[PDB]
Amino acid sequence: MPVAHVALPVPLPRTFDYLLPEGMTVKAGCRVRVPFGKQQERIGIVVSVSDASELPLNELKAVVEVLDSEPVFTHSVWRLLLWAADYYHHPIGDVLFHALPILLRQGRPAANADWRTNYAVSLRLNTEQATAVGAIHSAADTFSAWLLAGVTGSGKTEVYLSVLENVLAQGKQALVMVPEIGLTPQTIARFRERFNAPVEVLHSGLNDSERLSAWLKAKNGEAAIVIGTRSALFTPFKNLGVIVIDEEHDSSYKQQEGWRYHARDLAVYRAHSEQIPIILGSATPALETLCNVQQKKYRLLRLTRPAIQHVLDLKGQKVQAGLAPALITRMRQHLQADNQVILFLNRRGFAPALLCHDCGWIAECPRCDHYYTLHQAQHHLRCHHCDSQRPVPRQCPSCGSTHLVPVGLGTEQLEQTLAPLFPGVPISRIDRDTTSHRGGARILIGTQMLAKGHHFPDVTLVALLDVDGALFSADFRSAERFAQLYTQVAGRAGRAGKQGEVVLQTHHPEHPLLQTLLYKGYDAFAEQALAERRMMQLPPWTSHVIVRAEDHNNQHAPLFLQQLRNLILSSPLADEKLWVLGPVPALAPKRGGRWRWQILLQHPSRVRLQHIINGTLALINTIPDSRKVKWVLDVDPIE
Template sequence: MLVAHVALPIPIYRLFDYQLVTPAEVGMRVKVAFGKRKLIGIIVRIDQHSELDIQDLKPIIEIIDKNPIFTTQIWNLLKWAVNYYHYPIGEILFHALPILLRQGRTANYDEVKQWQLTELGRKIDIQTLSRSPKQKLLLSSFRSNSTIETNFKLATYHELQKKQLIEQVITQKKLNEWRNNFSINPDSIKLNNEQACAISAINKQNHHFRVFLLEGVTGSGKTEVYLNVLSNILTSGKQALVLVPEISLTPQTIKRFQQRFNAPVDILHSALTEKQRLNVWLRSKLGENAILVGTRSSLFTPFKNLGIIIIDEEHDSSYKQQEGWRYNARDMAIIRAKIENIPIILGSATPSLETLNNAQKHKYQLLQLTERAGNASLAKQSILDIRGLVLTAGLSQPLIEKIKQHLFLNNQVILFLNRRGFAPLLICHDCGWIAECPRCDRPYTYHQNQHKLICHYCDTARLVPEQCPKCGSTHLMPIGFGTEQLEKQLEILFPNTKISRIDRDTVSKKGALDSYLQNIQQGGAHILVGTQILAKGHHFPDVTLVGIVDVDGALFSSDFRATERFAQIYTQVSGRAGREAKAGEVILQTYHPEHPLLNVLLSKGYQEFAKLTLQERQQTQLPPFSYQVLIRAADRNNYHAPSFLQKIHNWLKTNYDNTLWLLGPMPANQPKKASYYRWQLLLQHFNRQRLQQILEQLIIEMGTWNETSKVKWSIDIDPIDN
C-alpha cells in the first residue's frame, strides 16, 4: 500500500500521512480528513513508509487534479523556499496558489454554455411561430447569425428549446494564440548610447541565466530599455514577467507596454476578484498572455514559456512580505530566473546596498544609465535651513515664495511629506491628555475630513470625541501636520490653483489615481501634495519644483537601514523635477543643514552615498557583510514572549560559539500592536550556510518545548524592518 505525505495549509512544520488507494502524483491537490474537518492538501512525497501503522492511516477522500498543480520550475522554487525561509511547507505551497485553487476549484476555465440552432431549427418555416412573436424574433436572430439580443427573457429560450428548435451546448474556451498576430508599434524615441549598450548586453543573454542591475538616474529611460528587451523576447514567442512594487503606482508604465505591443498584457494585483486572479493564472500557464505585470505574489504564477523577469524599483521594501511567510520577492525572483535559465533585470535609480554589493562582486552585471533621456537635465538641489523660521503647516516663507514663482510660470509643484492625515497627535489643551490607541499604546492620527482618529499601526478607527475623557474640556488641539493639513493650508495660500493630494487615503478607490494623473497630465499650474506614492515611477513633464517638507525624523532613526531608505526616497522624489525640457529645482527643508548624509546626497548623489554607507556597513559588519535572522514573539500578558525568546537565547549560547552574535530579547520597535506585546531576538552570523544550519537545529529543538505553543512567534530571514 502506498503512502501519500501531504502538506496542509496549517502552521505546523510537518507533513501528514494518508493511504493512497488510487494513482496520483507529487504536486496534486487532494481532499483529506483532518480531525473533524475536511481540508485541501498537496502531495509532497509518495512512498511505502510511515511512522504510523499504514493500516491505521485514513485514506485520501478525493484526488482533485489530473496533473500536478505546479509546473516543475515553480515546484523547485517552492522547495528551495521551504529550506531557506524555515516556514511551514503547507502554508508556503498554498500561498503560491490563487485562493480559488486553495479552496479546491479545478484548474480550468469555466465551461461556457451556449445556445445554438438544432437541425429542426434550421429547417422549420419561421411563420409557424407567428402567434409567438418573441420566439419568432429570437429564432430569426439565430438564423441571421447576428448578435443575440440580450433583452430576451430566459423563458423565451426555454420555449424554443421545448420545441427542439435550439439547444444548449457546453464549449471549451478557445486559446488565445497571440503569437500569430504579434506586432510591435513603432516608436519615435531615439536611444542614447548607454541605452543601446544595455539593450545589447541583455539580448546577448536571451537564453541563459544572468542577473543585470540596470542602474539609471531618474528620467534616464529605464522603461525604454525594458520595452526594447521585451520586443526581442516577445518576437521569439516567449512571455515576460514584470514585477512592480505597487500596481497602482505604475499606470503609465503599463500603458506604454500596451501601446508598444500588439499582444495581451495582463495585470495581477489584490484589487482583482478571485475569479479574475485565477483566470490570469490560467492564461499565463497556457501561454495566452505575452506580458504579466504584477505585484509581489505574481512571482509564483506559472508560464508556458517564460523568457525574462524584470523587477522594477528593485530596492522597494514592498517586495518583502511582512506578515506570515516573510519572503523577499526580489531575491526569490533571482532564484526562479536561475531555475528557468533566463535573464533577470533589476532596475532602479537607487539600488539597494545588497544589490550594489553583488554588482561590485561581479555576481550581477552592472549596466548604468547616467544621462537623462531627451533634453532633460538634472534638477538643481538646495538645502533650506528652517531653524528660527515661522512655519505654516510645515511650510517656510522662502519655500512658499518659490512655489509662487514656479506657479506664475504656469508650471507644477510637488510637495512631499511622508505622513498622511491632518495631524499625528490630538491633545487636550487643558490637561495634556493624548488620544491613544489602547491596542497599540501609540497616538491616533487625526483625520479631519473623516472626523476620525485612526491608528496607523492596527488600522482601527474611532470618532473624534466631543470633549476630553480625562477632564471634560472641549479644547482638543491637533499637534503636528500631515498631508491633509498641508493640502488645506495650500488651498488658503493658493485659492486659484489646482491642488491634488495623493496618499493612501485619497487613492484607495479604484481608478482614483488614474483620475489624478490625467488631471496632472493636462498641464498648467498645479500643486501635488503627497507621500512616497508620488516618488515612484511617475512622469510629470510640467513639474519644475519639488519641495521636501520634513525629513529630519529619518536622519536620526535607530534602524541602520533608515538612512538608506531616506536616500532612496529623496533621490526618487527629487527625480520628479525637470524631466523634459524645463529646468527643475529641488528644495529640502531641514533643521539640520550640516548633516553629512544630506550634504553627500546633494553634492555627490546617491552613488557616492551608497559607496560610503557600504564602507560603514563593512566596518560594523552589518548586512550585506553579515546575515541576519529576526525571531519575533508576541503575547497578551507581556510575560511568555520575552521568556520564550530568552530560552532560545540561552539554548543558542549553550550550543554555539561566539561566531553567532545575539542581540536581545528586547522589545520590538513598536512594542505593542493590536493588543499584543511584541519582543524580538536578532541572530547574526558571517556565514549564511552556517546560520541556516543553526536555524534547522533550533526549530527541531523548539518543537519539544511547551513554551512554543504559548506565544505567537515567527522567523524572519534577511529582515529589512527591525
C-alpha cells in the same frame, strides 16, 4: 499501499500522511481532498509519495479524492516554494496555498468553464541601450543577473521592450514584475501596443476567475508576456525566457504579513532554476543589489543622460510647526501664486531620537554609542541596540541648553497646527495609507516615495522634513530610504519648463552622507553607505533574521525571546561570528493592547544562519512558552 505526504493550509510546519486507496494514484504537486481534524475535510497538496510513514500505517486515514491528474505547479515554481519554505522558515502548507489562485485553493478544477510560429516584431536605440539589449541577447539561454541602472528618462523601459521582443522572437515567454503601484493605464497600453502576442496583466482589479484564466494561459503557452506585481512571480510558464523586475528597490516587493518573502530575491532564485536572464532595473538601486554587483554576482548595465534647492540649518531657528522660518516664507510665495506644496515627513510609528536644537548634539548610548530612542510619555531614552536605559536629561550635556527636541515625528496633529500658519489653505495627505485633488493652492503631506505613475503637476515646492529622522534613526536603513526618496523628488521637480524648488531642513546640513548625496548623487551616496555597512558588519554584508514576538502583559514575549536566544546560542553551529542581540522592544513597542519585542540574529553566512535556525526550530518544543506568545520569523527584514 502508497502513503501521500500532504501539505495542508494550516500554520504548522509539517506535512500530514494519508493512505492512497487501491486504484487511486497521485503525484507531487497535485491536490487532494483528505480528512482533517475530528470530522472535517480539507484540500491539500501532495508534497511527495512513498511507501512509508512515521506513524503506524493502521493509524492513517485514506485520501478521499485526487483532484488533479497533472500538477498545479511547474517544476521551477515548485522548487522555489520548497526552498523558500525552508529559507523563510514558514509552514509549507501556507507557502504552497498562498502561491495558488483562489479557485485552485478551494479545490476547483484547473480548467475554465499560436503567437510563436508567426511572431512579428513591430525604434532607434542609442549606443548605451543597444549595448544593454545586445548583452542580454547574447546571454539568453543561461542564468545571469543584470542590474540596469539609469535615472528616470534614461530609456530603461525601451531596453525592457527590446529585450522582450527578442525573447518573443525566440518563441519564449516573459515575466515582467512592477511595484504594486505600477500597473497604470498608460504603462499597460504601452506594452500591449508593442507586442503582436497575448499579454496578461495581473492587476489587483482582476476577479478570481480571470486570475485563473491568466494562470492557465501562461501555463499552456497561450500567453506570451505576464505583467504583474510581486505575486506574479508564482506564475506557471510553459517556456519562460526572461524575468524583468522594474523598480527593483521598491519596498512593495517584500511581503510584511503572513509569509514574509522578498519577491526580488525569489525571482533571482527562479531565474537560476530556469537558467534564464533576470534584469533588475532602477534609478536608485538597493544597496544589496549594488553589493551583488561589487561581488560579481550581478552584472551592471548603465544608462546615462532643473530644480532650485536649499538646505536649511535648523540649529537655533524659531520653528513654527516643525518648519524653519525661511521655509514658511517660501511656502507663502508658492501658495500665493496658486501653486501646491508637498511636505514629506517620516513614517508614522517612527521611533524618535533626541537632539539639542541649539548645538546639534544627539543623545547616544554610552555603552555602545548607538543613537538613543526617545520615549516621550515615559521620559526615557532606550537603546535599540543594547537595551540600556537613561532618563531624559534636562540640559544638553554639550552646551547646557534646555531646548532638547524629538526628531522623526509624523503627522501627529500637524494637520491641526499647520492651519494657523496658513489660514484658509486646504490640507490633504497623499500616502496610499487609506486604512487598508486638482486645484489651486494646497498643502500636500506625504511619507514615502510617489509611484512612477503618480504626478502632481501643480506642485512647485517640495520640502523634506524627514532628514534628521533618517540620519539619526535607530533603523540603519532609514538613510538609504531617504536617499531614494530625495533622488525621486529632486528628479521630478521641474523636469522641464516648470521651475521646481526643493527644500531640506536639518540640524546637520554638513552630515557626510547628506553632503555626498546632495552634491555627488545617489551612486556616490550608495558607495559611501555600502562601505559604512561593511565596517559595521550590517546587511548586505551580513545576514539578519529578526524574531518578533508580542504579548498582552509585557512579560511573555521578552521571556520567550530570552529563552529562544539561549537555545540559538547553544546550537552546534553557533560560532564566534554569530550575534544574537536583544531582546528589545520593537521600534513600535506597543500596538493595540499588545507589547512587541524582538531579537536579532546576525551571521556573515546566509546558509549557516539558516541551518542554525533550522536546528533551533526542530527543538522549539523545549520552550513551552512558544505557544503562550504570537511570534514570527522575519528573514532578511527590511524592518
